[PDB]
Symmetry: C4
Subunit: 103 residues, 4 copies
Amino acid sequence: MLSFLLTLKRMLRACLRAWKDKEFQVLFVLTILTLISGTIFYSTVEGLRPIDALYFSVVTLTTVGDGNFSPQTDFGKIFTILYIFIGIGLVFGFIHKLAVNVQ
Amino acid sequence: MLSFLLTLKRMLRACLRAWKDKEFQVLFVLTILTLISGTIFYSTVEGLRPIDALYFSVVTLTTVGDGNFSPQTDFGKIFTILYIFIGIGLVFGFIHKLAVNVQL
Amino acid sequence: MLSFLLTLKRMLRACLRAWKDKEFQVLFVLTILTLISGTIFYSTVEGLRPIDALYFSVVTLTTVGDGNFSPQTDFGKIFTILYIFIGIGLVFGFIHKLAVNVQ
Amino acid sequence: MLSFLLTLKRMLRACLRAWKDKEFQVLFVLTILTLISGTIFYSTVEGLRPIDALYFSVVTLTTVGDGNFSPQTDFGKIFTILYIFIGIGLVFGFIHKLAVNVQL
Ligand SMILES: [Ca+2]
Ligand code: NA
Ligand code: NA
Ligand code: NA
Ligand code: NA
């Protein structure tokens, strides 16, 4: 259906118009930076391969969770605690953003 | 008790009434496609029985998560990372939608 | 601080004013009903004690997840799939509700 | 690049500016209290080392979840059920707040 494509394209255009908003770019860079930091930390402190440090960082920051790995060191546990709250602060940031864009 | 039933039906209607919004429909289709790709990827790449691939696909895309399975290959891990962001993208889409539908 | 208590009490009052809203009561009954159904299903089909069937139902419907139990039967997996989407439909229901209450 | 920094600071300000809302403060305090009770309960009832009880408390209240630990006692299971709903109650509170702060 042509209607379907046109509607999708419009939506895709509206989505791309967000990656041009400064506040969104910030939130975006911040989560990327957060993901990098997590990758480094877990790779360093918990001794995970970079790929598994990124996976755990992603899965943790998004609340998906990992069914097998749990931080083994106390420093890792403390970091994960703060990491999770950064993630929540980030999502509220995006939520609030989407909220204001409805005004 | 009657009020409950009447409210339920009124709300239920509004829900099905939302299944009429073209943008909602696309979000929905996108989710199904996402779920199918996921099922295909995990069955193929991770060798999970089809039903187990849809399950992992569903619990992962919804952030529920699976307490026993985690992708075993680097290809799976990378795919899952992106898969998850697709899901978050889809949820914000629905939320943005619900937000717009509240304001007009 | 008296200010703190008064603010909390006001918030608590506003929260209780929700349990009087018909649409909220519905959403509330529905999730309770959903939790009951899950408890029954998992207790029956997956052979979990009622307490563990409720736990898994709660943890699943809220996206928290269980780090040890995963449905063992195909019927359980299919049910959990639909169960999760009911849960998401429920949360959007509450979200939409809170959204309209901001108007 | 300068715009980025200027936007970051403007946003950062608004965040700290929100740490001034009495209702936000209460939500925050409630969360900490919730996290402390949780830490106490799981250390006491489930016998988890304190730091492990705060961790489980945090990942559970945020729906992230723990892939290795699950409460072993019926008392823990029941408490966790309620703990989770408290967390959902708190999140809707914050969301309701963010919603009101957007409209005025
Ligand atoms: Ca596990
Ligand atoms: Na969530
Ligand atoms: Na999990
Ligand atoms: Na989870
Ligand atoms: Na989650």
